[PDB]
């Protein structure tokens, strides 16, 4: 038989939502600090780049990624959520950062470069969080 299963192909899942008109939202001093201080400092860090967009499993040749990671999150998504006033409180935003870091630790192993990057960003995150208003 001449069907060699070369199609259909893989793909990335749809990215996490950054808008949801029926979701409850507020502006708070804690959320303004999360955008102004926490996000924007991590975003400029030299270790930010792997976390600035959803994991592109096709481009990065990580065909197992979305087999393993079922609640993806990234800083591009968090940044859009903060700019769009998506959140109701600081906790919702902090949980997204926690998810992002945890996903990296789940997928990879201690001492991997990507894990070193996440650990460093997480340390900076936890420092900035300790001065939340
Ligand atoms: C080799 O890829 C990387 C190595 C160090 C770093 Br810092 C970043 C990358 S990457 O190109 O951004 N890929 C990559 C991204 C993420 C994110 C985001 N979270 O977890 C990740 C893991 C990543 O790469 C893991 C890795 O082992 N990639 C090579 C997989 N190879 C498998 C067989 O050979 C061809 C490709």
């Amino acid at each position: 038989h001449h069907h060699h299963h070369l199609v259909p192909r893989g793909s990335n899942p749809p990215p996490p939502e950054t808008s949801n008109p029926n979701k409850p939202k507020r502006q708070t001093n804690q959320l303004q600090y999360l955008l102004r201080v926490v996000l924007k400092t991590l975003w400029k860090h030299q270790f930010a780049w792997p976390f600035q967009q959803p994991v592109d499993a096709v481009k990065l040749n990580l065909p197992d990624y979305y087999k393993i990671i079922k609640t993806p999150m990234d800083m591009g998504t968090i940044k859009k959520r903060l700019e769009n006033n998506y959140y109701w409180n600081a906790q919702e935003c902090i949980q997204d950062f926690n998810t992002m870091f945890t996903n990296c630790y789940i997928y990879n192993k201690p001492g991997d470069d990507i894990v070193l990057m996440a650990e460093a960003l997480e340390k900076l995150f936890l420092q900035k969080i300790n001065e939340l208003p």
Side-chain angles (χ1 to χ4, degrees):
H1 200 242
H2 304 307
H3 200 339
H4 294 185
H5 316 267
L6 298 167
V7 282
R9 306 295 298 177
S11 51
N12 290 311
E17 73 184 8
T18 58
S19 282
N20 179 339
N22 282 313
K23 181 189 174 298
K25 33 196 84 80
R26 304 188 296 188
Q27 297 172 29
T28 73
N29 283 341
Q30 298 187 332
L31 286 162
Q32 288 188 317
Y33 178 97
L34 283 160
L35 181 51
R36 282 191 20 267
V37 171
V38 180
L39 187 282
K40 268 155 175 178
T41 63
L42 295 190
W43 191 268
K44 287 133 64 220
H45 196 282
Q46 65 161 340
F47 291 170
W49 61 270
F51 309 100
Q52 285 172 335
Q53 59 288 311
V55 171
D56 186 337
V58 178
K59 181 180 170 180
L60 307 171
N61 211 357
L62 307 182
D64 58 352
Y65 187 82
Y66 293 109
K67 307 305 183 200
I68 297 162
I69 301 303
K70 302 311 191 176
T71 64
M73 188 50 56
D74 66 280
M75 288 203 296
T77 297
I78 295 167
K79 181 174 186 276
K80 283 221 269 149
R81 284 177 176 192
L82 289 162
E83 290 167 349
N84 293 356
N85 305 296
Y86 180 86
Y87 296 115
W88 176 263
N89 63 21
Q91 193 277 322
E92 292 183 340
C93 176
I94 292 166
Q95 182 159 338
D96 288 339
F97 278 102
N98 294 336
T99 300
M100 180 186 80
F101 291 127
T102 291
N103 289 343
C104 186
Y105 306 145
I106 292 165
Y107 180 75
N108 302 285
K109 58 171 207 128
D112 287 344
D113 277 337
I114 189 76
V115 172
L116 301 177
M117 282 206 185
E119 286 171 356
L121 292 175
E122 188 186 1
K123 168 177 156 186
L124 267 347
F125 176 69
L126 290 174
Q127 286 179 29
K128 298 307 202 178
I129 290 271
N130 271 326
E131 308 302 329
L132 197 72

